[PDB]
Amino acid sequence: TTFRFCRDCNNMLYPREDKENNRLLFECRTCSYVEEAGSPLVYRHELITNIGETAGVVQDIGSDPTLPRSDRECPKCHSRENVFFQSQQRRKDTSMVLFFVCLSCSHIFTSDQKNK
């Protein structure tokens, strides 16, 4: 969705249409600053979303002693050490798919075999 903020007063820009060119601009509601749009998308509602599945991954995730260890193979470095966890979204509609984080390259993969 790429929200854009004003360049002069750091306020929030809003979409507007210019009929002279029949184009889309983003203008600030208080300072009169305009900028041509880059994409035609201005709104998105994600009723079924996968954002937050891997939230919480940090450079020191492996330092957590509570995370379970696994022997699965990371298919980018051929390593056997990794820490896996379930989806972090608490909605009662998600699958039990596991997400594995490699302790050698910090890569994240999944155990899904249906859609991947």
């Binding site: 509570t66 995370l67 379970p68 260890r69 966890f85 379930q86 039990m96 596991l98």
Partner: protein, 56 residues
Amino acid sequence: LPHFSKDDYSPESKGFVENSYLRGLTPQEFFFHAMGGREGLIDTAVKTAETGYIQR
């Protein structure tokens, strides 16, 4: 409990008492069984009161 790893769904992790009373319960099984018994006791008390009111 603070003895298993995060996101553990095994029976021993979610409260399956494998042992019997004759053998004896391991500490985790003991705690889970105590939780169940507490549920039963609370149900007993509340249901006693409500049933008394209903009967009256």
